[PDB]
C-alpha cells in the first residue's frame, strides 16, 4: 500500500516524545517499514528542503534540523499521507486541534517537534532520500482485522 | 434520561479495544444501563441492518456481524445520541478526527470498530431488539457533580 | 486453556472503573469468553459466598454485593487464574501494588473494587453459577503472537 | 509572555480531575505562575462574575461557585489565553470535541468543570483579584526546545 | 481522617510532573485538602530539613530545595501517610518498582521528585509549618464508594 | 554513561508495543543514542545468542528472533543496565509483576516482547556486535534535572 516519510525534529526527540508518536500511529494500524537515529547532513538537509532554497529563512531550517538526532521513520497503509498530516495538525500548533500531536504538545512555529510528506510524489522522494532500500521491509503482513 | 445503543464489532473484539471504549464513555459521564457479549445470529442481523435490504451490499454487512463476538452496550443521559457519534467519528476513520474512536484506531470504512444509534427513534427499536427488559437497569443514579 | 471468574463490584462500577479494568486484560493478553451487567439476586449471592455462611459477616458481603449492578466476566488464557490475582493486588489495597488494580484505585477492605476466583476448582463452580454454557464463547482465536 | 487566568470549579474539584487538567497544560509547554486551592469568598465571586450582575442567573453562578473548593491556576506562554479556551472545548460539553477536557469529561452546561479568561484584558483583571503578587512567580524558565 | 504533607521538589516541577503526580492520588481516592506553589525561603526549608543540620549534607539540601518552585500539598484518608511513601517509592529510584512515581520517572537520589512525610508526627509538624490553617480544608467531603 | 542494548523482538512489533516501550525509558531520562528497525540475518542471530549455542533449543530462539523484524535500540544513563531489566520484568511474564513490561503485556516465556542486556559486559559485546560506530551518538546531553 501507500507510503510516508515522517522526522520526528531534534525539538521532539530532546522533550522525549519519540515513543508516544510512534505509539500513536502503530495504534491507528499503520505498519512500520523505516526506522533509524540520526544526526542529519548539511548536504542531506539541503536536498530535503530543496523547494524552498530561492527564500532568506532555508538556512535557518538546515541549520536546527543537523543541530541534534532527528528520529527518521516511514509507515505504510491505505490514504497514510493525508492521514498522518491530519494527525500531526496544522503549521501552528497553537492553532492545532486538541488530539493532534502538535495541538497536544507544541506552542511555536519553529519548534513544531514532527513533520510528514504533503503529498505521494514528495513522499516517493523524500523517502528514496533519507532511506536505502535495504533499510525497508519488503514483505508487510497487517492485522486482517484492519482491512476487509 | 435519553439511551442510546453501541455495538463493538468484531473487529473492535479481536483488536482488543472493548475497555478503551468503555472508559470513554464512563469518562464523559454517561451511566451504562445494559452491556453483554454474544455471537449475532443471522435474523438477529437481518433485523438490526434492515432500512439496507433492498440494496446488494446487505448481505455484507450481515455475514461480517456474525463472524465473531460483538459487545453490546446502552449507555444512559443527557443528548447521549448525537454525543455518542460526535465521540465516535464519521464513517471513513481516514477523515475521523483525532481524539475520536475511528479516528485515533480506524482506517477501513468496512473495518470501523464501534457504532451507535443514529437518532432517537432508531436507538427505542434497536435497544428493544439486543436487549430484554429484565437485562436493562431500571433505576440510574449517576454523580450529583454531572447535572445541575 | 484455562479460564477465570471476575466481578468488579458496585462500588467499582459507581466509580467507572469497568472499561479501565477490562483494558489491562484484553492489553496483557487474556480473552474474553463472557461478560454482563446485573443486579445479582439474594440467592446467587448466598451461593457466592457459599464458603463463608457459618461466620457472622456473612450477611454484609451479601447485602453489599446486591446493593448495586455487577459487571461479571470470564476470560480465558495460560495460568489466567493466578495472573489475574497478582493484576488485582491482595486483600488490603493500601497495601497492595502500586502498578495493581487496588493499589491503584482503592482504599478500604470493604470497598476494593473487584474480585477473582483463588483457584481453578473455585473458578469452574463459580463460572457455571453466575454463566449459562449459552452465554460463553466455545471458540476462542487469540493473537498467535502470544503463545509459542 | 502572555498570562491566563484558569479554575476548575468545584465540579470538577470533586470529581477528581485536578491533575488530569493541569497534566494537559504542562504537556502543551506552559509554565504554571500560580496555583492554589480555596473556597471561594461571596464578594470574590461576586467580583468574578461582575460583567453578569444585572441579569437574573447571576446568583445560580455565585451560589454554585462557593459551595465547594476551587483550584485556581495561572499559566504562562506564547497566545495562552486563545489556546487554553481552544483546549477547554466551547460552552455545551456536549458540543465540545473530543479531545477537548469538557469534549472528554463533560454533560451539562452549568456543570463544565473548568474556565479561563476569555481575553487578555479578562487576564490581567481576573489575575490581580484572585493572587496577590508575591504568589505568583516573577522569573519564569520554560524549556528552550519550545521556543526559537 | 489522616493526613500526610507532600512537596513535589524543583526537579519534578521543571519536568512538567506535578499533574501526573496529582492524578495518581486523586485516583487512589485520596481528597485535597491543600495545594501551593511557592519558592521556599532559607528559614523554612532549615527547619523543614532540621533533623538532619549536624550533618555535612544539610546545605545541599537547603540550597537545592530554594533554588526554585515547589509545589506542596496535603492530602486525606485512610493510612495516607504509609500508603503515599509506598506509592513514592523507596530513596534510590533506579531500585523503586515500576508503577511507583521514582520508579517510572526518576534516576538519581539527588533528584528524586517528590517527598512524603515518613511518620504521622513528622506529616503534623510540617503540615503546620508550611500552611497556615485558613489554608486547609475543614469539612472533607469524600466518595461514599470508598469506605464501607 | 553507561549503556544498555535492547531489543523489541518481533511479538512485541507485530503486536503494535514499539511505541510504548520507547515511551517507559524516554520518561525515565534515560537517553536514546541507537535505533533501528532490522530483519536479522542469521549469523547475527547465531551470534546473538553465542553462549547458548551447545543446548538443543539454541536453533529455536535463532529460527524465531529472524522470522520478522526487530528493532534495536542502546539507550544511556546512571545504571541503565540493572534499571532496564528491573523495568522489564523477570523470564516468565505470568509472574512479573503489574507495572513492568512483561507483567502488563507478555503470557508466554517463547514470547516474551523485549530483551535487554544481562551485565555490561554482555552490553558492550551486544552494543558492538548490532551497531556500526557511526550510528551511535557520541555528544550525549540529558536533561540537567535529572542529575545532581
Ligand atoms: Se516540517
Ligand atoms: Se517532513
Ligand atoms: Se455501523
Ligand atoms: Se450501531
Ligand atoms: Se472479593
Ligand atoms: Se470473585
Ligand atoms: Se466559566
Ligand atoms: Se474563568
Ligand atoms: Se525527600
Ligand atoms: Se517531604
Ligand atoms: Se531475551
Ligand atoms: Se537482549
Given at each position: 500500500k501507500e507510503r510516508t516519510f515522517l522526522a520526528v525534529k531534534p525539538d521532539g526527540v530532546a522533550r522525549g516524545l519519540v515513543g508516544e508518536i510512534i505509539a500513536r500511529y502503530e495504534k491507528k494500524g499503520f505498519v512500520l517499514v523505516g526506522l533509524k537515529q540520526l544526526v542529519p547532513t548539511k548536504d542531506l538537509a539541503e536536498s530535503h528542503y530543496a523547494?524552498?532554497?530561492?527564500?532568506?529563512?532555508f538556512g535557518g531550517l538546515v541549520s536546527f534540523i543537523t543541530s541534534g538526532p532527528v528520529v527518521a521513520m516511514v509507515f505504510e497503509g491505505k490514504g497514510v499521507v493525508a492521514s498522518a498530516r491530519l494527525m500531526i495538525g496544522v503549521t501552528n500548533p497553537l492553532a492545532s486541534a486538541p488530539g493532534s500531536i502538535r495541538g497536544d504538545f507544541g506552542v511555536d512555529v519553529g519548534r513544531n517537534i514532527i513533520x510528514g510528506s504533503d503529498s505521494v510524489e514528495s513522499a516517493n522522494r523524500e523517502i528514496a532520500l533519507w532511506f536505502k532500500?535495504?533499510?525497508?521491509?519488503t514483505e508487510v503482513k497487517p492485522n486482517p482485522n484492519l482491512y476487509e
Open positions: 523547494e524552498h532554497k530561492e527564500r532568506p529563512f532500500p535495504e533499510e525497508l521491509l
